[PDB]
């Protein structure tokens, strides 16, 4: 009973998230967006963050350790378990981390301030997150298909 | 619209651009939305200039709230790409914001500039 309760809870979470901020859940998904909003306190409390704050939203002990003793900074927080970055790879994962950061800050300010004439379908409402989805997934497939470094092809002899 | 401290007055806008350009040569100026917001949250800023004609205006509508809170003036130019190549980076900055130091004629120019903005209010 507890399990089913949690299941339908998550159903509610995704639906209510689409209701509030369709752009962000068009980017990343209701669960990780919910985690963000949670650590934010509020939607506007999130939307006053800058893009880099969103990139490392969460990793607070790790961040402040590396800064207060001058070590290498953590690269991401909850965006790691977010869905889009799992299809990158390594150095690509960092580049996607930055790009997903900035476009998320965009979407959050968008849904957090842009009004809509309330005869407004959700798709026309979330077109910007959709655009971000498309552009960004294209960029991810590109950097995945970045070639490797041509090396001189050796034959049988050293020739 | 929402850009209610609009600055269309031409000599005013030209003075703002030139001051930004001078400040860009003095490294006392932050280029971009995200960095503007960082600068104001860290409080170091002393003036902030935005651009009216962005297509979703909302990505900069979050700045006036913070600057009303932390009490620094903000003002809109009408042309983003003008602001961008005023910084000198070739891509249309939408938000620039320039800060204070101790002893600079540039600091003086900033003070007269924010006086002009408070006039425009």
């Amino acid at each position: 009973e507890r399990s089913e309760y949690r299941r339908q809870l998550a159903e509610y979470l995704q639906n209510r998230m689409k209701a509030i901020s369709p752009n962000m859940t068009e980017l990343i998904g209701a669960l990780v967006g919910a985690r963000l909003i949670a650590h934010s306190g509020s939607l506007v409390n999130l939307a006053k963050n800058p893009g880099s704050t969103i990139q490392i939203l969460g990793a607070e002990k790790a961040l402040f350790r590396a800064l207060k003793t001058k070590h290498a900074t953590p690269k991401y927080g909850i965006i790691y378990h977010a869905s889009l970055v799992g299809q990158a790879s390594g150095p690509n994962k960092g580049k996607i981390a930055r790009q997903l950061a900035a476009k998320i800050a965009l979407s959050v300010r968008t849904d957090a301030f842009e009004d809509f004439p309330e005869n407004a379908d959700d798709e026309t409402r979330a077109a910007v997150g959709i655009q971000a989805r498309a552009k960004l997934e294209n960029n991810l497939r590109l950097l995945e298909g970045k070639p490797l470094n041509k090396g001189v092809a050796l034959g049988p002899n050293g020739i | 619209s929402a850009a209610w401290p609009k600055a269309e007055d031409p000599a005013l806008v030209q003075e703002l651009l030139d001051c930004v350009q001078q400040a860009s040569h003095y490294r006392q100026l932050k280029k971009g939305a995200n960095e503007t917001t960082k600068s104001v949250n860290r409080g170091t800023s002393e003036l902030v200039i935005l651009a009216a004609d962005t297509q979703p205006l909302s990505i900069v509508l979050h700045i006036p709230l913070i600057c009303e809170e932390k009490n620094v003036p903000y003002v809109y130019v009408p042309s983003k790409v003008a602001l961008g190549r005023a910084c000198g980076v070739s891509r249309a900055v939408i938000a620039v914001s320039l800060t204070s130091n101790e002893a600079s004629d540039l600091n003086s120019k900033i003070r007269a500039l924010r006086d002009k903005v408070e006039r425009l209010a």
Binding site: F64, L67, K68, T69, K70, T73 | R42, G43
Partner: peptide, 30 residues
């Protein structure tokens, strides 16, 4: 640079706190 900024932020907050405390401890009236 990053380290310097963090310590700068903390000290800025502390100056804010201390300024408030100093003022509350201590042609004006018509």
């Amino acid at each position: 640079l990053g380290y310097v900024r963090t310590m700068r932020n903390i000290a800025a907050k502390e100056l804010k706190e201390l300024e408030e405390r100093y003022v509350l401890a201590g042609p004006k009236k018509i």
